[PDB]
Design a protein around this ligand. Structure first.
Ligand SMILES: CCCCCCCCCCCCCCCCCC(=O)OC[C@H](COP(=O)([O-])OC[C@H](O)COP(=O)([O-])OC[C@H](COC(=O)CCCCCCCCCCCCCCCCC)OC(=O)CCCCCCCCCCCCCCCCC)OC(=O)CCCCCCCCCCCCCCCCC
Ligand SMILES: CCCCCCCCCCCCCCCCCC(=O)OC[C@H](COP(=O)([O-])OC[C@H](O)COP(=O)([O-])OC[C@H](COC(=O)CCCCCCCCCCCCCCCCC)OC(=O)CCCCCCCCCCCCCCCCC)OC(=O)CCCCCCCCCCCCCCCCC
Ligand SMILES: CCCCCCCCCCCCCCCCCC(=O)OC[C@H](COP(=O)([O-])OCC[N+](C)(C)C)OC(=O)CCCCCCCCCCCCCCCCC
Ligand SMILES: CCCCCCCCCCCCCCCCCC(=O)OC[C@H](COP(=O)(O)OCCN)OC(=O)CCCCCCCCCCCCCCCCC
Lengths: 459, 171
């Protein structure tokens, strides 16, 4: 993975030695070159993973997450260069260095062969994200939101540290390749009960679990646009990646430990979706929709069937692209009206027709329109949870009504109706903004032509 | 633990030297010159055995050789010896230097009638050799078996197999 780690590190002298008018264009160019090189991870086999070294490997789970991670950095640079145009030059370079450092932590989070190196990178991803939210967020509440984002994660994850070192002492290793072959059945006990909780609650916070999700509609709202893109597109998927690695070690106890959490997600995706019906803050509406979509990934991991893991990784990649595009659209209005209130600027299809087409496509992929990979992941999780219990389709289908209802109401409030009369600074869409929308949406629609690369280790 | 072994009161009966300390101090240099051999045999046995119960008989020889020392004074030179230990006996610190003329008369009478030479300065403090027939104590401290030491280090030092083996570090 060192062919991806060293170019990401060389982005640091690339961004600190550039000319002052050149520090966006060079980083965008070479991050796009790294994302072009990211397709060499697709050397995946039907039997074996692509095992690079003692430290790094990549199966078909980490590979779409790595391509999405290396693809999201140029899009974050495009999104975050307008509102940081008036910024000091050294602080602008520090912002770009925090995004580069976060990508550098993420690409060896997803490729960590050993689980405590996974933990170290997985918790190293806090510090650039925390600094970005609490330094380049706009409002007052970013300090409090950074505290919530920090201390839900660490309160969930410092038990995970003790649990991983306990597995290290018991099994002798935390190599995932060794633990594929040395995994022992985890019997029913209270010791193994709190073992399961210490392995799972950090990722339950990262997904987020409903009830633990309170950090998210602050940390995804009080952040700048690049922070919201990396949080909702990648950093919610560290939890699903970690669960799909760690439930190997937690059998057969998971088969009854999952029952409360599944309820917390199956009811949670009813509640949070319903919350999106009555949100005034558009960025908070996208945040509670993110909680609603990640509840399905929690259910699909906790029922641990093949169709569920395929649908869960498809839904994670699809939700990454979709929610990142939705945050970028909310920023495209917020750079014009300077308020995140959704009822403020209405009827924007009368003024921005192509941007309203981007809103339409993002909302149709949000409501899981076939044959988008949003619907592929949605539908496969629905199939596997129907095999889990035939009643859950009700809680699925009612969700699939409300998921439609907030996706179009967001379209109806922002883009339709009569426009707001007193707002007259609605500029035409810049080429940068439509470029960002197309670089979100065109990969998302091209993946419908060949979805087997985003279906994970057991396609 | 075990019962301590005390000797009988008959094993402790001996003819005592019932003289005062000024009598002993006045006759001390001639006692060290004449009663050398059984005294040094006893003190060799006393520092080697580290037990008075293993040193009774030699001790009795000391109490046998002292008395024969005094009788040989009492037969021949009772007057200068009495006149000398009385003068030694007057002093509260029992100084030899207060009594040099009675010392000279006692030494003259002893060297004439018995041939004893008083030891010079330095002689009675010498470390002497003693030829005994009793055996050397092989375990005078009655020490039991000592524990075996831990096994030492041996073998050429090879590198660490796969380095530190700390969690993910390869060196
Ligand atoms: C490998 C090579 C592949 C080549 C083929 C390409 C494959 C698909 C790629 C994406 C295609 C769509 C891209 C354009 C949409 C975004 C921009 C836009 O709105 O432009 C409007 C604009 C025309 O409008 P305008 O008047 O100028 O201004 C816009 C108005 O202001 C206002 O606009 P509006 O509201 O009037 O018009 C928007 C309208 C609004 O209409 C809708 O929203 C209705 C759509 C949903 C219902 C109908 C479709 C349902 C699903 C069935 C179709 C798929 C399966 C069919 C097969 C049989 C059944 C299995 O949408 C359209 O007209 C687009 C029709 C196609 C929509 C696709 C479905 C999107 C829905 C959400 C996801 C659902 C699943 C997607 C599955 C994709 C499978 C590939 O179009 C352009 O300028 C086109 C620009 C160039 C597009 C390039 C596309 C490819 C890019 C990939 C590059 C790299 C690979 C190389 C291939 C290059 C090929 C050329
Ligand atoms: C004819 C006579 C002469 C012959 C000459 C032959 C050589 C010719 C070329 C000369 C140069 C050779 C360079 C050393 C050999 C390659 C070492 C290497 O790549 O190890 C991969 C190493 C292990 O990966 P691998 O694929 O299993 O091993 C490949 C080889 O077999 C590695 O071999 P190994 O298995 O024997 O390695 C032993 C072990 C392998 O590692 C392990 O066993 C795992 C433990 C590694 C440490 C993990 C710590 C995690 C927590 C902290 C994370 C910190 C934040 C990350 C960075 C943030 C930004 C600074 O190394 C360590 O434990 C040492 C720690 C890592 C130091 C690597 C060398 C760095 C020198 C330059 C430093 C510049 C700043 C670098 C960034 C700072 C962080 C390192 O990769 C990582 O740990 C990932 C991070 C990348 C490390 C630095 C890469 C070196 C090149 C940097 C150039 C770009 C600089 C950009 C500007 C400054 C930063 C913004
Ligand atoms: C998001 C916030 C909440 C996070 C929740 C995190 C998980 C909840 C439970 C955590 C328990 C503590 C870590 C358990 C690690 C288990 C590792 C192990 O070896 O287990 C088997 C061992 C068993 O011991 P053993 O394995 O050494 O014994 C040998 C084996 N037998 C049993 C056969 C003899 O379990 C324990 O030793 C104790 C486990 C429970 C510990 C309870 C103390 C912690 C109290 C709760 C803390 C909750 C979070 C705190 C933060 C809240 C917010 C601020
Ligand atoms: C709040 C915010 C939103 C939510 C976020 C997540 C928070 C909760 C996370 C933990 C959820 C509870 C623990 C997991 C439940 C697993 C099933 C279970 O415990 O069932 C109840 C149990 C039934 O008995 P049984 O499981 O057989 O126990 C013997 C074990 N050998 O019943 C009993 O044994 C009786 C009760 C025992 C006490 C258990 C206390 C520890 C667990 C709760 C902490």
């Amino acid at each position: 993975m060192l062919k991806y780690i060293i170019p990401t590190m060389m982005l640091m002298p690339l961004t600190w030695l550039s000319k002052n008018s050149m520090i966006w264009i060079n980083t965008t160019l070479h991050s796009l070159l790294i994302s072009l090189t990211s397709l060499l991870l697709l050397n995946q086999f039907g039997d074996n993973s692509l095992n690079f070294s003692l430290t790094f490997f990549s199966d078909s789970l980490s590979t779409p997450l790595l391509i999405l991670t290396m693809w999201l950095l140029p899009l974050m640079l495009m999104a975050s260069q307008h509102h940081l145009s008036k910024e000091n030059l050294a602080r602008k370079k520090l912002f770009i260095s925090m995004l580069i450092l976060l990508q550098l932590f993420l690409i060896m989070t997803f490729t960590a062969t050993e689980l405590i190196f996974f933990y170290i990178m997985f918790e190293a991803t806090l510090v650039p994200t925390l600094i970005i939210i609490t330094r380049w967020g706009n409002q007052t509440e970013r300090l409090n939101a950074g505290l919530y984002f920090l201390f839900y994660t660490l309160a969930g994850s410092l038990p995970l540290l003790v649990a991983l070192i306990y597995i290290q002492n018991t099994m002798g290793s935390l190599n995932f390749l060794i633990l594929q072959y040395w995994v022992q059945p985890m019997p029913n006990s209270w010791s193994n009960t709190f073992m399961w909780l210490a392995c799972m609650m950090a990722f339950m916070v990262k997904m987020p679990l409903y009830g633990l999700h309170l950090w998210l509609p602050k940390a995804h709202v009080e952040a700048p646009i690049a922070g919201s893109m990396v949080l909702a597109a990648i950093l919610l998927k560290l939890g699903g990646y970690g669960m799909m690695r760690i439930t190997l070690l937690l059998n057969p106890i998971t088969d009854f430990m999952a029952y409360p959490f599944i309820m917390l997600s199956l009811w949670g995706m009813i509640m949070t979706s319903s919350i999106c019906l009555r949100q005034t803050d558009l960025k908070s509406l996208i945040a509670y929709s993110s909680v609603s979509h990640m509840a399905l990934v929690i259910v699909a991991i906790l029922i641990q069937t093949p169709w569920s893991y395929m649908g869960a990784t498809a839904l994670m990649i699809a939700h990454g692209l979709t929610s990142s595009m939705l945050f970028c659209l909310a920023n495209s209005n917020y750079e014009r009206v300077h308020s995140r209130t959704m009822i403020l600027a209405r009827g924007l299809q009368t003024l921005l027709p192509l941007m309203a087409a981007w809103w339409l496509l993002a909302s149709l992929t949000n409501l899981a329109l076939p044959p988008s990979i949003n619907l592929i992941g949605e539908l496969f999780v629905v199939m596997s949870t129907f095999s889990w219990s035939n009643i859950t389709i009700i809680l699925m289908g009612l969700n699939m009504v409300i998921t439609a209802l907030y996706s179009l109401y967001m379209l109806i409030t922002t883009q339709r109706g009569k426009h707001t009369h007193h707002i007259n600074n609605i500029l035409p869409s810049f080429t940068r903004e439509n470029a960002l929308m197309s670089l979100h949406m065109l990969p998302l629609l091209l993946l419908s032509l060949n979805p087997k690369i985003i279906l994970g280790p057991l396609y | 633990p075990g019962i301590v072994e005390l000797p009988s009161l008959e094993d402790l009966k001996v003819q005592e030297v019932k003289v005062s300390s000024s009598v002993l101090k006045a006759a001390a240099h001639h006692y060290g010159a004449q009663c050398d051999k059984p005294n040094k045999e006893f003190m060799l046995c006393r520092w080697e055995e580290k037990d008075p119960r293993r040193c009774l008989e030699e001790g009795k020889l000391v109490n046998q050789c002292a008395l024969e020392f005094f009788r040989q004074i009492k037969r021949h030179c009772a007057e200068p010896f009495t006149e000398y230990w009385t003068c030694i006996d007057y002093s509260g610190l029992q100084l030899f230097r207060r009594c040099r003329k009675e010392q000279a008369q006692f030494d003259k009478c002893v060297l004439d009638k018995l041939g004893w030479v008083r030891p010079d300065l330095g002689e009675l403090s010498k470390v002497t050799k003693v030829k005994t027939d009793r055996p050397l104590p092989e375990n005078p401290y009655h020490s039991r078996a000592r524990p075996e030491p831990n096994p030492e280090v041996e073998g050429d030092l090879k590198p660490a197999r796969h380095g530190s083996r700390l969690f993910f570090w390869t060196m």
